[PDB]
Amino acid sequence: NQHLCGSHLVEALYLVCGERGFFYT
Amino acid sequence: GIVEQCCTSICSLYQLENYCN
Amino acid sequence: KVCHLLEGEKTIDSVTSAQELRGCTVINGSLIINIRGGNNLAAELEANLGLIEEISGYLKIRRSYALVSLSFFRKLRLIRGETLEIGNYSFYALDNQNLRQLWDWSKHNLTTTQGKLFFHYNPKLCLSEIHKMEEVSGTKGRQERNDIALKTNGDKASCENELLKFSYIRTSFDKILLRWEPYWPPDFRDLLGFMLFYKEAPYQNVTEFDGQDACGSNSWTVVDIDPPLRQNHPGWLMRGLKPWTQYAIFVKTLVTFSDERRTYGAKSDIIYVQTDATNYEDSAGECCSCPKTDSQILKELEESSFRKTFEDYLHNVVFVPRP
Amino acid sequence: HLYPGEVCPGMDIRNNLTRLHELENCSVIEGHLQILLMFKTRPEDFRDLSFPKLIMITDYLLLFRVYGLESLKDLFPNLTVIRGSRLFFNYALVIFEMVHLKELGLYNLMNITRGSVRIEKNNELCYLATIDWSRILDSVEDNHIVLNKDDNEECGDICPCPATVINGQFVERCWTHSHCQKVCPTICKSHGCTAEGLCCHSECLGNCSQPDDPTKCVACRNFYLDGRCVETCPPPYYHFQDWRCVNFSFCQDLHHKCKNSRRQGCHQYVIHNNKCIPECPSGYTMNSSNLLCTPCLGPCPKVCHLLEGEKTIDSVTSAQELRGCTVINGSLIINIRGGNNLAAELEANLGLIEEISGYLKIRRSYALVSLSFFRKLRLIRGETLEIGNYSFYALDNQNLRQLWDWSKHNLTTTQGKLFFHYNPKLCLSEIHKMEEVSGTRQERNDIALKTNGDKASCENELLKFSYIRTSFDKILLRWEPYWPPDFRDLLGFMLFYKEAPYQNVTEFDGQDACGSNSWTVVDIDPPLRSNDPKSQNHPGWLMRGLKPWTQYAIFVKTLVTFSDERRTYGAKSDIIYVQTDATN
Ligand SMILES: *[C@@H]1O[C@H](CO)[C@@H](O[C@@H]2O[C@H](CO)[C@@H](O)[C@H](O)[C@H]2NC(C)=O)[C@H](O)[C@H]1NC(C)=O
Ligand SMILES: *[C@@H]1O[C@H](CO)[C@@H](O)[C@H](O)[C@H]1NC(C)=O
Ligand SMILES: *[C@@H]1O[C@H](CO)[C@@H](O)[C@H](O)[C@H]1NC(C)=O
Ligand SMILES: *[C@@H]1O[C@H](CO)[C@@H](O)[C@H](O)[C@H]1NC(C)=O
Ligand SMILES: *[C@@H]1O[C@H](CO)[C@@H](O)[C@H](O)[C@H]1NC(C)=O
Ligand SMILES: *[C@@H]1O[C@H](CO)[C@@H](O)[C@H](O)[C@H]1NC(C)=O
Ligand SMILES: *[C@@H]1O[C@H](CO)[C@@H](O)[C@H](O)[C@H]1NC(C)=O
Ligand SMILES: *[C@@H]1O[C@H](CO)[C@@H](O)[C@H](O)[C@H]1NC(C)=O
Ligand SMILES: *[C@@H]1O[C@H](CO)[C@@H](O)[C@H](O)[C@H]1NC(C)=O
Ligand SMILES: *[C@@H]1O[C@H](CO)[C@@H](O)[C@H](O)[C@H]1NC(C)=O
């Protein structure tokens, strides 16, 4: 699919920035 | 609007690296 | 046996209104089936007018609520189109709140001589069945400007179905283990569950809507199965069985609707599994626990869409793009 | 001692555990608390990590996707009130997808004021059915406890407790293995208790140290001033954020801090009705050396520009983002899926809007029965239509029955059309009156005749039975003839009957059925139009196969053909009750 939906967006976007972090202001 | 991009359309990996700081 | 009709039309609204029709091969006249309810209606309509072969006038399914398929017209192969409704219509159907199957076009052949078609406001009837009727019926040849409601035929009927495939069948003398492949539609939270149907079936001609054809009753035992974690193969162990008995089984998926009126789905074919042996009976009757309400289905679907919307709101709120 | 630690702003704590150092001094949060997205943590991290000073959160708590945390009995041992002044999508406590979380352990959570609880996808969380939410929430009907370990009958639930017989069973109520739910008696409802039961001051909320002391409570239920639970605060002060009162130097001080254009997320604070507020309501501006809202010369309505001229209203948070605003300079879309009913806070939040210069879209809403929550809306300018040139759009609403009370409300569309599809509970009478009242000219409105009003009784005029003949089996009925102002638009009658041993049979509502408690429906052709006012033309019907000495509930409805003409709504009789004659 490559539609990162659901909780797969979380666990599959964590593999992109596992040590950098998610962005916030 | 990450659900408006990566869930409804398909995100590229750089466009999805945007959210990682 | 020709059965002429007084005053042309013949409204049928019950079992009894059809019992003036038993043994009729060719009905001279038109029929307006308008069935709003009844009791054990499928086999009774099959017994009363399953033998109808040809109808000289037109046919009409005005507002008929109880029936699920027109499969009880088993030998119906020709509508002559002599008498027509206004609009030059040889088949007419509207406001059919449970009409899900028109006919099984793999096994059935219908000829419509003259007169167009009409399908407005059939909620659970797919357009694929309608186009199959357009082609098999004899309207593509002899091109007729048929009038089919494109937007109100198929409402809450999944018509884009993929194919589930079984993987594992482990028989016993009183239990059967089944595991089919995992399914996920393009958003996996849409899949609410599967619906294992089964039915003891001594013959391999059991289609989906054979049996039930009625609101209020059903021929298939139904099991509703939550999905697994997203890999795991799902399945079910059927438990209260009989030894040395052939069964008919399929699995159908039920999904939610996206915010565009777009549906998905998959539906495994009918497979027959016989158990092992040890040391008015067409069906069972099936109310040891009577099945799930359609309004309860819509409540469950809305519960699903509500969990999906809250999760979407949370992922929208938390993740912030780089400026 | 009520609140010795400070009063913090809203905390967002992600990607680490370090930012939780900033909760070492928070007794009350004037904001929300998002603890979320902590992947590389372990229960060895959450062992020496405790926040006992935290007492109340004004907005909401959000725990999302945190590994290693097993119980909140160490993080929040004394969280006593969530106020819920700002919710998180209707909800005030959200415990979502906490993986290693074993038990809640919120054993001081005694009262959540506004908004409810949602707790789901906690795969190994138990101790849920022993919490007694009815004594925790003012409204319990929209909690959400789905998808847990306790979803399986597996998890435990053993604890030594008041043993409520509130439901039909004997459930001892407990948070942990070693903490029971503190159940006050019937009298001291939310004011406070001691372990002796000697109830404390009525101006308090949740727990309290000393009985009958306005300072030795825990959380105040009305207001906070100088370490004391005050009921209303007297005005040399001003109220502030619905929970505490404060001096004028503070409110002008925050006006000075946002008066300098340092960000674009603050507001220059003013005062209205003794309450320090972000900006003045409609019809007021501030006197600059006084910062109080004085009425303007005539109208000065509060205009609220929408981001990209569009805003979807989907919960109490998104609705509350339009509190106070009276001009909407863009378009709204209400999309409120599922839930029980939340038109009350839709009315408290979207009640005062008078203008919209865009379109008003209503899509996919399920728990809405009426748009009366638009209490004061009178104008849709149509200056930014939806594509298809619509100023009012309505689609796929399963429970909407009433647009407005048209005997009491005016509405006007300056330009644009009307859209009404898939609205089964909303009669065409309400839509037709909307087209008449709104000023819509002919304008070619797509108002779908067959997908509107399908599942509701939509007959204004009425029928009556004239002649009744009972028997042991049959019943003859004749009712007084209906004829529409065009008798071509009369399809037939729908005679309903069922069997009823009592007379508590509710009226038919539009949804159909055939199973067992189902109206047997007979379709009847209309009689021949005799062109005589007094003739044979009375319609009737004979009921054949009925059983003796039994009571049937009967009525009759008409069946008509709709059109773009706004007439022929048909006639509906009333429920009568017939006892058939007995026999041998
Ligand atoms: C928690 O305490 C609050 C007071 O802050 C109670 O809220 C009041 O409840 C009554 C009826 O229950 C409502 O009519 C009022 O509108 C509420 N007041 C406010 C300010 O919201 C609440 O009942 C308590 N919760 C319980 C007892 O579960
Ligand atoms: C998280 O913590 C590490 C060390 O504790 C630090 O270097 C980093 O900047 C922090 N923040 C993010 C967003 O990773
Ligand atoms: C049907 O009946 C009508 C009138 O009774 C007659 O004219 C017609 O020929 C009949 N058709 C057939 C096929 O019997
Ligand atoms: C129906 O058929 C008749 C004759 O075949 C034709 O004259 C008429 O135009 C048709 N269409 C109608 C009535 O809409
Ligand atoms: C299936 O086959 C059996 C015998 O082979 C027959 O009696 C039965 O009527 C058939 N069912 C259908 C729907 O054709
Ligand atoms: C919290 O209070 C302590 C006690 O004085 C102080 O040292 C510290 O700076 C305060 N702030 C934080 C963020 O810990
Ligand atoms: C209430 O407050 C007292 C003192 O503040 C404390 O000992 C007790 O644990 C609190 N909670 C309950 C449930 O009594
Ligand atoms: C107003 O109250 C604040 C504390 O909330 C205090 O710091 C300030 O000095 C007060 N101003 C007065 C009393 O003028
Ligand atoms: C919509 O409105 C614009 C301007 O009023 C007009 O140019 C356009 O043709 C309209 N479209 C339709 C479908 O009515
Ligand atoms: C509605 O409009 C009428 C006439 O335009 C006016 O008299 C009345 O005051 C308005 N407001 C209501 C009924 O609240």
Numbering used by the authors:
A (entry chain B): 3 to 27
B (entry chain A): 1 to 21
C (entry chain F): 310 to 539, 546 to 594, 675 to 718
D (entry chain E): 1 to 160, 169 to 448, 451 to 594
Original paper wording:
The human insulin receptor is a homodimeric, disulphide-linked (αβ)2 receptor tyrosine kinase. The affinity of IRΔβ-zip for insulin was determined by pull-down from conditioned cell-culture medium and shown to be sub-nanomolar, i.e., comparable to that of the holo-receptor for insulin (IRΔβ-zip: IC50 = 0.55 ± 0.02 nM, hIR-A: IC50 = 0.46 ± 0.06 nM). Only a single insulin was seen attached to the complex, consistent with IRΔβ-zip mimicking the negative cooperativity of hIR, i.e. binding of one insulin molecule to IRΔβ-zip markedly decreases its affinity for a second insulin.
Improved maps were then obtained by focused refinement of “upper” and “lower” volumes of the complex, the upper volume encompassing domains L1, CR, L2, FnIII-1, L2′, FnIII-1′, αCT′, and insulin and the lower volume domains FnIII-2, FnIII-3, L1′, CR′, FnIII-2′, and FnIII-3′, with the polypeptide without the ′ symbol being that which contributes domain L1 to the insulin-binding site. Resolution of the resultant upper and lower maps was assessed as 3.2 Å and 4.2 Å, respectively, using the gold-standard Fourier shell correlation coefficient (FSC). The structure presented provides insight not only into the signaling conformation of the receptor ectodomain but also into the nature of insulin’s second site of interaction on the receptor surface, seen here as involving domain FnIII-1′. In particular, an interaction is discerned between Arg539′ and insulin residue HisB10, with the side chain of Arg539′ stabilized by interactions with that of Trp493′ and Phe497′. A reduced off-rate would be consistent with the formation of a salt bridge between the mutant Asp/GluB10 and Arg539′. The insulin-bound αCT′ helix is extended (with respect to its structure in apo sIR) in an N-terminal direction back to residue Asp689′, with the polypeptide being traceable back to the triple-Cys motif at residues 682′/683′/685′.
